[PDB]
Design a protein around this nucleic acid. Structure first.
Lengths: 101, 121, 252, 233
RNA sequence: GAUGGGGAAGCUCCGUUUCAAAGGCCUGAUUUUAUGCAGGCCACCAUCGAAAGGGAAUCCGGUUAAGAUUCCGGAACCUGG
RNA sequence: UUUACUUAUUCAAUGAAGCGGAGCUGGAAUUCAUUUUCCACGUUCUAGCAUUCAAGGUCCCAUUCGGGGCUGAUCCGGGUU
C-alpha cells in the first residue's frame, strides 16, 4: 500500500507538482479522440478503491464531455408556454457530466 | 546510430501479414445439398394448343420452370435429363408469376419424338 | 409575424449560388518554395467567360517543380493579356502587366490587383471587373506595405502577400444601362435568386416590418441600429447619416 | 573515355524536375506520433518544478554498468529453478523432516513497488534503484522523499525496462537490495558512496533547482540573433 | 448520402474530402513458392442519383385468335475470351 | 499604460516539400591586424522541350546480362509552415 502516498499527493491538487502534470495531460487528452481506451489507469489508487483489480477483464476508457449548461433546444429561442417556461440559457440538466461520460 | 530515408512526403499503413482463416469449427452442419438440381429446375411441360403447334413445326420444347433458374441451368437440365443437344433458349415470366421457357433443340433431334417419349401429347 | 425575406436568405435553400456553368476557383497559384525564393514562369492557354462574374478568367499553365506534369491555375484576367503571353510569377519577376510579384518587390504608386489579404491566401482584394489596388508606400520594418483599396479605405498588409500586376478586365461594365428587365433577369439568373425584389412597404405587416397601412408608407424611422436583431434589420443599417450628399468626396 | 556524353541537370528553380530528396524532416506522421513528440517538446518547454527534474538527472553508463553487474548476479528464480526447489523440498519433507529448512535462504533481489515502500518505512532497505519513466509519474516521485528522509540511498537509473530485465518481467521501475552475500561487499560500499555523492547529498540543492523553460532550436536561434546582438554583435 | 471525425440527455445532427496511418495497381520470383519475397510504383479516396441527358452492337421478309427491331427464314454487327 | 517570451488557445495553408542556424563560393564593402559586416549564392527577345533510384566522376563486388556505395544535389537541428 504505497497507494496511500499517491492518494495524498493527488489530494494536494493546487500544488505545483500536480498542476504541472495537469497542464501536460490536459493537452495530451485534448489531442486524442473524445472517447478512447486508456492503456493504463492514470491514478491507479483511485481506480483501485472504485473496485478495479489490474488483470484480464477490466478495461479503462478515457472520455471527455462538453462542459457547462444544457441549453434547451426549442427553435429560434421560442417556447410557447406560460412565462415560467421560457428558460433557455440558465437550465442545467439533472444528471452530472460524469454520468453523460 | 541511424534513421530511415523517406522520399515521398507522406506516411502510409504497412502492408502487413494478411492472415487467412483457420477456424476451430465449421460454420454449419454439412454443405447444403444442391438447391437447384435438374428436377428442381424444370417443373413441367405445357400442353396448351399453342405449345403443341410450336412443337410440331418449330422443333421447340416448352417448359414451366422455377424462377431462380436461368438460361444456363435450363440448357444444363434439359441435356442432363433428356439426352439432347440444345440451341437458343428463350424465357419469359408469365402473367401469373410462372417462368415459361421456349427451348429449341438442334436440327439433329426431333421435338415430337422427345415429346411423346417424355409422356405429354 | 412571418419570417421575412432577408431572414430566409441565410437558411440556404433556393438562394444558394447557381454554379453549373462556373469555370472554377479564381485563385492564384500556391505560394511555395519556387515562387517565394526566385521566380517561375507560365503560359496562358485560355481566357474565358465565367458566368456570374463580369471579369473574364485567365487559364494559365505552369510546370510543377516536384513532378513531370502540367498543373493548371486560373487567375482573374488582367487587362492586356493574350493567349500565349508568358506570365512570370514570384519574387524576382518583372514589373510587366500580368506578373504576380510580392508587395515588397514593387515600388510605390504601383497598380496591382487580386492582392492577397495575408501571405498565401490565393486572391482576396480588388478581384472585381475593372477594380484595382494602388500600393502607396512601404513600411519596410515588420515588412508591411500600405495600400489603396477600391472603396477608398486604406490597409496595412504583409509584403509577402502576392498580387498580380495591372487592372482587371471588363472595366466600364456598369457604364451601359441594363435597359430592359429581361437583361437584368438574365444577369441575375446566373448569380442567384435575389431578383426581382418586392418592396417591403407593399407587402402585408406579417411579411415585413415596413408593411401595411392604408397608404404605402413606413411610419417608424427607417434607419435601424447595429445592435438591432435579425428581422428588425430591414432598412438602412446603422447609418451614420442619410439623404442626398453634396460636394466632392473621399472626404479627407 | 568512351562515346558516353556528359549531360548535367540544372536544378535551378524553374528548369528541370527537382528530384528525390530525403524529406524525413517534413513528412506527415500519424496523430499518435505527433502526440508523443509534442508531449516531449511541451514538457521541455514549460517551467518544470523542483520535485520533478530530480528525475532526468540520472546514473551514468559506467557506474550504472557496475550496478547492473552487481544486481544481475542476484536475479530471482524462473520456472525451471522454482520447479527445482519444489523437487528439493518434496524430497526433504519426508526423509530429512526439517520444517522449512531443506533449501537455503535466498539472497536474490527484493522488489515490488508497494513492497519496496514497506521495506523503506522500517529501514530494512539498504539500497534502492529507481527508473526515470513511469508515465503516471504519481507513483515513483515520492520515493526520493522517503529515501532522503529514511537514510537510504536512491539511484535514478535509466530504463524501467532494464530494471525489468534483471527481475524477469517486462517492466518494474524499482529494485532494492536489503540482504547481500558478504563477498561483493566492498563494491557495495563503493556504490553507496558514489550514489550518495551523485543524487542523495544534492537533494537540498535540487529542492531549489527549476528545470525546463528550454526553448527549441529555432526559438533559440531567434533569441540569439535578436536578443544577444543588441549590445553585442 | 455512409465511414473518419466533431455535436447532442438522446430520437439522432453536421459533414462528405474533411485536423485518417483511408488503398489497390502492372511487372519479376519460379521450378521448396501457395503467392510470399528483393523491388518500383501511383493518391485520388465510398455509395445512390436521369427506363427523355452520356451510352458498344440489328436490319429485312414472313408468322399469331392475341406476340415480335424479341419467334421462323435470310443477312449483319459488337463485346469478352 | 506600454512592450517582450511561447508550449496552451486561435486562424490559415498545403499530395504539411526546401524552415532556421551555419557555410563554401562571387559582388558591395569597411579592413588597422584580414576582419567588422551587408547583398547575391544556376532560368526573361520566341505558345516547342524538360519524367524512367539522372547523366558524369569515383571506391568496393566482380565485370559473364551487370550490381551496391559516395558525390553530382555542402552541412547540423529532424519545429511541415
Amino acid at each position: 500500500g504505497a497507494y496511500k502516498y499517491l492518494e495524498e499527493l493527488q489530494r494536494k491538487k493546487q500544488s505545483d507538482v500536480l498542476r504541472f502534470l495537469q497542464r501536460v495531460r490536459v493537452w495530451e487528452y485534448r489531442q486524442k479522440n473524445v472517447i478512447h481506451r486508456a492503456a493504463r489507469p492514470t491514478r491507479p489508487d483511485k481506480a483501485r478503491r472504485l473496485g478495479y483489480k489490474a488483470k484480464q477483464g477490466f478495461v479503462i476508457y478515457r472520455v471527455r464531455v462538453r462542459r457547462g449548461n444544457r441549453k434547451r433546444p426549442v427553435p429560434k429561442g421560442a417556447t410557447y408556454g406560460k412565462p415560467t417556461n421560457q428558460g433557455v440559457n440558465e437550465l442545467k440538466y439533472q444528471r452530472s457530466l460524469r454520468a453523460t461520460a | 546510430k541511424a534513421l530511415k530515408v523517406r522520399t515521398s512526403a507522406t506516411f502510409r499503413l504497412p502492408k502487413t501479414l494478411k492472415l487467412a482463416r483457420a477456424p476451430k469449427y465449421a460454420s454449419k452442419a454439412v454443405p447444403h445439398y444442391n438447391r437447384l438440381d435438374s428436377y428442381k429446375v424444370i417443373e413441367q411441360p405445357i400442353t396448351s394448343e399453342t405449345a403443341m403447334k410450336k412443337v410440331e413445326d418449330g422443333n421447340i420444347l416448352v417448359f414451366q420452370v422455377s424462377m431462380k433458374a436461368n438460361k444456363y441451368q435450363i440448357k444444363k437440365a434439359v441435356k442432363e435429363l433428356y439426352e439432347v443437344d440444345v440451341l437458343k433458349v428463350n424465357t419469359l415470366v408469365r402473367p401469373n408469376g410462372t417462368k415459361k421457357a421456349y427451348v429449341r433443340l438442334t436440327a439433329d433431334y426431333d421435338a415430337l419424338d422427345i415429346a411423346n417419349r417424355i409422356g405429354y401429347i | 409575424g412571418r419570417v421575412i425575406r432577408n431572414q430566409r436568405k441565410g437558411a440556404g435553400s433556393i438562394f444558394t449560388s447557381h454554379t453549373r456553368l462556373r469555370q472554377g476557383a479564381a485563385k492564384l497559384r500556391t505560394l511555395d518554395y519556387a515562387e517565394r525564393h526566385g521566380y517561375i514562369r507560365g503560359i496562358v492557354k485560355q481566357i474565358v467567360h465565367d458566368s456570374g462574374r463580369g471579369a473574364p478568367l485567365a487559364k494559365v499553365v505552369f510546370r510543377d517543380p516536384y513532378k513531370y506534369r502540367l498543373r493548371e491555375e486560373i487567375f482573374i484576367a488582367n487587362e492586356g493579356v493574350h493567349t500565349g503571353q508568358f506570365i512570370y510569377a514570384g519574387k524576382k519577376a518583372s514589373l510587366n502587366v500580368g506578373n504576380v510579384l510580392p508587395l515588397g518587390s514593387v515600388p510605390e504608386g504601383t497598380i496591382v490587383s487580386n492582392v492577397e489579404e495575408k501571405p498565401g491566401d490565393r486572391g482576396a482584394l480588388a478581384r472585381a471587373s475593372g477594380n484595382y489596388v494602388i500600393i502607396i508606400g512601404h513600411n519596410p520594418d515588420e515588412n508591411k506595405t500600405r495600400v489603396r483599396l477600391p472603396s477608398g479605405a486604406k490597409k496595412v498588409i504583409s509584403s509577402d502577400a502576392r498580387g498580380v500586376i495591372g487592372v482587371i478586365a471588363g472595366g466600364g461594365r456598369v457604364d451601359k444601362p441594363l435597359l430592359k428587365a429581361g437583361r437584368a433577369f438574365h444577369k441575375y439568373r446566373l448569380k442567384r435568386n435575389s431578383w426581382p425584389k418586392t418592396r417591403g412597404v407593399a407587402m402585408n405587416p406579417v411579411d415585413h416590418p415596413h408593411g401595411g397601412g392604408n397608404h404605402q408608407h413606413i411610419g417608424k424611422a427607417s434607419t435601424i441600429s447595429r445592435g438591432a436583431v435579425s428581422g428588425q434589420k430591414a432598412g438602412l443599417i446603422a447609418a451614420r447619416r442619410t439623404g442626398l450628399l453634396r460636394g466632392s468626396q473621399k472626404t479627407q | 573515355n568512351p562515346l558516353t556524353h556528359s549531360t548535367p541537370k540544372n536544378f535551378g528553380i524553374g528548369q528541370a524536375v527537382q528530384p528525390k530528396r530525403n524529406l524525413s524532416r517534413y513528412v506527415k506522421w500519424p496523430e499518435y506520433v505527433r502526440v508523443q513528440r509534442q508531449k516531449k517538446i511541451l514538457s521541455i518547454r514549460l517551467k518544470v518544478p523542483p520535485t520533478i527534474a530530480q528525475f532526468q538527472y540520472t546514473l551514468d553508463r559506467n557506474t550504472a554498468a557496475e550496478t547492473f553487474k552487481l544486481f544481475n548476479k542476484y536475479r530471482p528464480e524462473t520456472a525451471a529453478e522454482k520447479k527445482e526447489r519444489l523437487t528439493k523440498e518434496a524430497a526433504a519433507v519426508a526423509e530429512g523432516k526439517s520444517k522449512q529448512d531443506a533449501s537455503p535462504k535466498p539472497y536474490a533481489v527484493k522488489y515490488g513497488l508497494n513492497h519496496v515502500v514497506a521495506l523503506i518505512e522500517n529501514k530494512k532497505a539498504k539500497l534502492v534503484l529507481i527508473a526515470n519513466d513511469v508515465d503516471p509519474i504519481e507513483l515513483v516521485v515520492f520515493l526520493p522523499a522517503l529515501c532522503k528522509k529514511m537514510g537510504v540511498p536512491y539511484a535514478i537509473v535509466k530504463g524501467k525496462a532494464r530494471l525489468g530485465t534483471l527481475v524477469n518481467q517486462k517492466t518494474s521501475a524499482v529494485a532494492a537490495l536489503t540482504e547481500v552475500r558478504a563477498e561483493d561487499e566492498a563494491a557495495l560500499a563503493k556504490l553507496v558512496s558514489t550514489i550518495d555523492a551523485n543524487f542523495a547529498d544534492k537533494y537540498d540543492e535540487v529542492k531549489k533547482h527549476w528545470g525546463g523553460g528550454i526553448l527549441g532550436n529555432k526559438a533559440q536561434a531567434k533569441m540569439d540573433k535578436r536578443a544577444k546582438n543588441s549590445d553585442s554583435a
